Structure formats: C-alpha cells, structure tokens
Design a protein around this ligand. Sequence first.
Ligand SMILES: C[C@H]1N[C@@H]2[C@@H](O)[C@H](O)[C@@H](CO)O[C@@H]2S1
Ligand SMILES: C[C@H]1N[C@@H]2[C@@H](O)[C@H](O)[C@@H](CO)O[C@@H]2S1
Ligand SMILES: [Mg+2]
Ligand SMILES: [Mg+2]
Ligand SMILES: [Mg+2]
Ligand SMILES: [Mg+2]
Ligand SMILES: [Mg+2]
Ligand SMILES: [Mg+2]
Lengths: 434, 434
Amino acid sequence: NEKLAKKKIVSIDAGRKYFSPEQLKEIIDKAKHYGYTDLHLLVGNDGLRFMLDDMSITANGKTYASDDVKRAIEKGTNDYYNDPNGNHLTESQMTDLINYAKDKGIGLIPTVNSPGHMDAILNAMKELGIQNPNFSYFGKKSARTVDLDNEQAVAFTKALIDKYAAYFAKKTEIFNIGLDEYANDATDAKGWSVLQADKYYPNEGYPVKGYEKFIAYANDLARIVKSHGLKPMAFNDGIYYNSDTSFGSFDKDIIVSMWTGGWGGYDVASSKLLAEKGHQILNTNDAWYYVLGRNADGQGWYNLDQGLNGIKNTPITSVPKTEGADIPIIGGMVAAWADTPSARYSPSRLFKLMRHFANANAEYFAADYESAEQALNEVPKDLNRYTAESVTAVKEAEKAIRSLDSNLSRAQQDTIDQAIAKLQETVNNLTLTP
Amino acid sequence: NEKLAKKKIVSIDAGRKYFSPEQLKEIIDKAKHYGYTDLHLLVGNDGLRFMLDDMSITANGKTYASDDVKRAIEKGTNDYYNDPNGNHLTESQMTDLINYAKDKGIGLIPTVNSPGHMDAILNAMKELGIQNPNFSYFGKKSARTVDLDNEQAVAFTKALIDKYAAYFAKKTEIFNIGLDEYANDATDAKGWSVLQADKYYPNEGYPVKGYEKFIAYANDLARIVKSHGLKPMAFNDGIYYNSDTSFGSFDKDIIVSMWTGGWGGYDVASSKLLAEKGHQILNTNDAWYYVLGRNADGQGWYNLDQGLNGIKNTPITSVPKTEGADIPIIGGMVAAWADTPSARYSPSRLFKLMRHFANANAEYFAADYESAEQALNEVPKDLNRYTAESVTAVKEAEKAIRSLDSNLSRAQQDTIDQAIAKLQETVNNLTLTP
Ligand SMILES: C[C@H]1N[C@@H]2[C@@H](O)[C@H](O)[C@@H](CO)O[C@@H]2S1
Ligand SMILES: C[C@H]1N[C@@H]2[C@@H](O)[C@H](O)[C@@H](CO)O[C@@H]2S1
Ligand SMILES: [Mg+2]
Ligand SMILES: [Mg+2]
Ligand SMILES: [Mg+2]
Ligand SMILES: [Mg+2]
Ligand SMILES: [Mg+2]
Ligand SMILES: [Mg+2]
C-alpha cells in the first residue's frame, strides 16, 4: 500500500518547446499504461506556452489589456525560440487535456517558472513598456531572471501567477512555482551565492538584501497559490542555499522538488535539512534526466543513455543529498527537458525513458488492467447453447479476473496476464451442446 | 430577448435564520417553476450559517485552528439566535445544493455580510481572543459592525471572505459582500453620516478617516472576490453615501444591489449616479420585501400584504431613486428576510410572494416546459396498431410541441398549455385498426 500510494510523475518541458494536444495526450496514454499517477507539464520555462482566454493583468496602478498581454507573450516566447510546430496551448486545449487526463486517473501539475527561467515573461513586460525588468550582475544582464528590486516587474509577475493559479484551481492539486537557478546566465551559475553575498561581504556591490527579497518573493507566490486551494511546489536549489537559515524562513507548505545534490561551488541544502524544516519532498533526481536530442552516450549531459543508467542505478527512493538520513518522499518524478528546443522530439525515446523508470521501480507503479477490462468486454454474453461443463469454466474464469486485487503493482502484472490467458482459453473451449 | 435575458432572483435570509437543504431545494423547485434564474442565499447576515470543512484562518501572524474557528462561529451564531431548527449548512450540503440548482438551470449567489450585519463573526473573533473587534460610537457598542481601525479584526474578516470566495469559485458567478447599514444599532441608523462626519466636522470625536477606510475595505473585498473569478456585489446604501465622491472611488466591478432610495436624513446616492460611475445594477427594490411572520396588513414594515402591493405597483424595471433617469438593470431580485428569526417560516407565503413577482412581470420570466416534457414522455411510442388518420394527428401534435420556441415567457404560457392539451386529445383519439 505505501509504495503504490506514492506519486509517479513524468515531467515534460513544454515551456522551452511546443508540444501539441495530440502529443501530450499520447504521453498521458503511456503514463497511464506504465502505472504513473501524474503529468508534470512545464508551460512557463524560458518560453511561456499557455494562453488564457482573458490575459488582462492589473498591477502597477493600471491594467494591461488582454490582447496586448497575449501579443507581448507570443512575441516574447518567439524571441526566446520561435518554434515552427506552434507557439502556445489555448485555454480550451488545456481544459480538454486536463479532462482527458482526469478520465484516465492522471493528474496534471503545471509549472510557470519565476523568478528565473522566465525569458518570455521578461520580454513580454518590456513589450508592454515596463522598464528594466531583468536582473543584472556587474554589467551582465540576465535574459532569464527578473530583478527583485523592480517593484513593477515583480508586481506584474505575481499577478500573472495569480491569474494562472486561478485557472488551475479545482482542476489540479499542485502548482510548481519553480524558483530554480537564479540568474544562472548572468552569474555563471552562482546566482544564489550572489543573492546572499552582501550580508557577508558588504560594500562590494553585491545586491542589497538579495536573498531576503527572494525568500519574501517565494513566500508571496506560495501565499497566492494556497489562496486558490493549490499546493505550491518549487525546485530545491535556492531553498536554504548553502544551508543558510539566517535570512528568513521558506513557507513550509512549499513541496520541494528535489532535483540536484549540487556540485563544485554550488552548495545546496541537504534533503535532510529540508525535511527537518518541515517540507514534503518529491524526488526529482537528475540521475534520470533526458534532454531531447541528446540521444546516446557522448552526446552531452543528461543524454538518454546516461538517463537510462541513472534509472538502472538510482532507485525512486534515492533522493539527492541525504547526508545518510532516511528521507521520506511523496513520490518520484522522471523528467524530459528541452534545453535545445529545436531538437526533434522523439516519442519512442521518451516512452523508453518512461518505461525503464516504471520497470526499475515496479513495486511502486500501478499494474495495467486495460487489457483485462477489454477481455471482459469480449466474453460472449449468452452461454446457454454451450455444454454445462464448458460454461462453468468460462464463468469461473470471468469471476477470477473480476476477483483480482484492484491495487496490484506493475511487478505483479503476470498475475493479471495469466488470468486473461485463462479466460481466453475457457472461451476457446466452449463447446456447443450436441 | 432582452427581457428574458435578465436575471430574476429570489433572495432568502439564511444568515439570521436556519433553512434546511430540504427547504432550500423546495424554494429552488418553485424558482425554476415560476421562471426565475437564481437563488440569492444569504449565509452570513447577522448569523453565520455555513461551515466549510477546513475553517482554519491565517491572519495576524498566526493561524486560528479549523476546529476552534468552527466552535467560535457556531457559538457566535447561537449568541445571535440559537435556532432550534439547526445552526449551519455544511460544505457537503452546500455543494449538493448548488449542484441541485445547477441541474435545474438555477444559479446560486451567496452573501457573507460585512462590515455590518456580522454579529456572529464578531462573536467568533472574540471567542478566538481577538480584542475589541466591534465598532463603538460615543460609548454605544455595535453588536453587528466591525471597527475598521482594528487591523486584527479586519485582517481576520478579509481572510474569512477569501476562504468562502475560494469555495464558491467556479461553482457560482457572483459573491455578495453586503456592505449595508454600517453600525445601524450604535448610531441609530446614521452610520454612513458618522463615517463621513470627521472630514467636515473635525475635532468633535467622529471616527478619523472613517468613510475613507470603508471605501478601501470595500475595494479590498472586491479585489479578493475578483481574484477567484467571481463578480463582487454589494448593497447600495453606503456606496457614495450623500452622493459624496470626494473620499475615494468604489471598484466599478462591484455590481450594486439597489435596495433603497433612502429616507428622512438617510440620503443615499441615486441609481443615476451609480450607473454614471460605471456600476451595473441589480434591482432589489424594498417595495417587494417580506419579513417572515409579518403576514398581513398592520403586522409591521415589509409585511406580506405590503410586499404584494409593492409587487403589483412597482414593476421589475422601476429602480429606487432614479432622479427621473432611465436606469438599465441586470435583473430584479425579490427578497424574504428573517429580521425576527424565531418567526415561523411559511413556504406557502414565500411561494405566493414569488408567484406574484413572476406574474406581475410575466414577460421577464421564463415559461414552464416541465409539463410539456412530461407529456412528451407519456406519448405511446409505438403507433402501428392504430389507424393512419389517428396516427398522423398524434405525430403532428408531438411535432408541434417539439417545435415551440424554447424561449417563451411566462406571459405566453397558454401557447405551451394549448399544445399539451392538443397532444393529449390526439392521443385520446387514437383508434385501433378494425
Ligand atoms: C530544476 C531544473 N532546472 C534545470 C532545467 O532548466 C534544465 O532543463 C535541466 C536539464 O539540463 O536541468 C535542470 S532541472
Ligand atoms: C440590504 C438589506 N438590509 C436590510 C436587511 O438587513 C433587513 O432584513 C431588510 C428587511 O427589514 O431590510 C434591509 S434590505
Ligand atoms: Mg472567463
Ligand atoms: Mg531575447
Ligand atoms: Mg480561486
Ligand atoms: Mg479541502
Ligand atoms: Mg451578543
Ligand atoms: Mg489573493
């Protein structure tokens, strides 16, 4: 019961790269087939590729008109990557997609990323006429990150998240506000250290109250998300960066998507510390990542062979940076990313990744009852014309399928498959009365 | 088309007095029958008689626990009026009620009143330990009205409205924040004048920035309601009281429920001014009111005979205080109130009020197709055994009912009724083949 109760999630970066409703439905179908519970769909992640019917934003003592906001966002996304396959999902398409998934027992968790990975929102704010929304670091301007000192940019971003959270309310359960990799371009992947620096190295030009403002921003977004009955989620790397609790406290209702244990000079809080601070954790281990188009060994970081190795060697229970502690999880999430969004999306490769993750952690993933359900639909309804002996065999075989535990794991698939094979054999053995 | 497109609403004061799900369903059934579009259900109006499953409130740097909030509210409501029939509707009952109404094409519009008519919320705040939440006027303490200078009381109230608005989001369209009759007890029905007084009569002890704070409070509640995709509505009397626009501006997205033209020394803005300021208006004329238990002439203000006279003499298009202007309306609302909540609720009297309002404005109210639908269900399906002539008559008569305009008004009911009578006659005249 405890293993199957976990969430098993596939993540798709539909922020950087367009995915059609048709493609996303296929992913949902495989998710259901392999025993997953949720699709985690990034729609704001560098690009912004989801448009509400009403995009009007009220911030800064005014309202930015819906059609201007839409034009600004479409243009801003194209400035990031003008995808020949499409620009954005519409509200009708998203509503239908979420419905389609819900009918299959699959949840959807959106991401609209900020204050990093928000290239298109920054572009859009500039198109609307908001001044200098981007963060800069000693004359290097970030293309991806808002400046938390810019009240008008921050107000516009919060109102945009409020608008999206209102749409997702009641049809979803978790909203991922992101928070990963602050100003990774402008600071050469040292953004958290930069935000914390002035406290410890004053009078050197580091951003004043940088990290303090970041905590308040994270907490303000968590408040917005909670106000719509949704659980806020965020990536781990900026949450108590350098294990430093002295700047303030993150909202404990933020679920942590634990994706990285950090690296040389990128010293993240342990999952131990985060659990201790009262955060639930979704294991989003980068061991399992696939960046689209990096399709074999040698083709770069998070190539498909690397991801498949990570899946084979790092079980769903193995969370980044535990400090040897036993870290409880709400589930595991395998992620496909579109860092090079002009890469060809290969459904077979994504499905291979998804299948391997399910197979490697088979006790966690739901079994497939689809074919048992269909076999039951295909049984002849009326058996009177057949011999009593042969009829009994079919009725007992149907009864046996219907009696199967409805909570079997993928590890126990053969129990279901044997029961189907038995029914089919009895049906084949029906003998007409002489 | 324009008349039938209007909202036709019955209002029920289930704040002061308990109404069961069963009773409210009967009211919905009559509403549908008479051609109404909506039930306007006050649930916070002196008493507070609707409890969410999670009532935890975060305000004032803390959280008031759900069970403590529930206990505080139940007790606070009982302190206002301990109704032997019941205390509150639960979340499950409300969800079911709204569903029941939606299946009948009837919307539900809740009211949770503040900053007046909030006796039970004030009591509840005191039970939780919030200090001095009530407004006072020269040593007379209001039992019904929060003090807008009390930041902790105001913060708790706003968070309570946010919690209710979140529940009603997506299953309703309008949320009535009330705003009527500020401190009517403590000021002898002069509360708006008291809030405005200090601006014009300084150094006399009147509440400093009273009305300015009221505008900001109204606007803050409207912002909260809009954030959940709902349209905020409020009663007219405190909106530009004394036609004074100099204190600030009310949110134009507040629909005005225009209920009173005012009276001696109670000088409200005209509906002309409110329409000019950009507010849509729901005609809630007090001409049509019935206070439960005031059942005949001589039994007090808003007695049933008075209400029935008001219905006969004041059409749905006649809005209070027009200044002779032509005032557009979104619809009309007939209201039953429970000022003396120990009064016996008489469904027949409420239905008489509802019926008279529909009959007096018959071109506005939808016709009843229920009996036509049932007559069609009762037609014999198989007619082969009957003579060709008699069969043709039935088929033509069925076709005629099915061809009726689906947007007839109550004024045109006889067209539907004649078509039913014709079908029934043809069915009676079916003649078996010899
Ligand atoms: C939390 C996420 N942040 C980064 C994401 O933007 C990249 O696409 C991914 C693959 O390069 O790596 C990390 S995971
Ligand atoms: C807006 C509403 N405020 C008052 C309401 O509290 C009373 O029950 C009703 C009947 O006495 O009269 C007015 S209507
Ligand atoms: Mg809309
Ligand atoms: Mg650019
Ligand atoms: Mg909401
Ligand atoms: Mg709940
Ligand atoms: Mg009392
Ligand atoms: Mg809000």
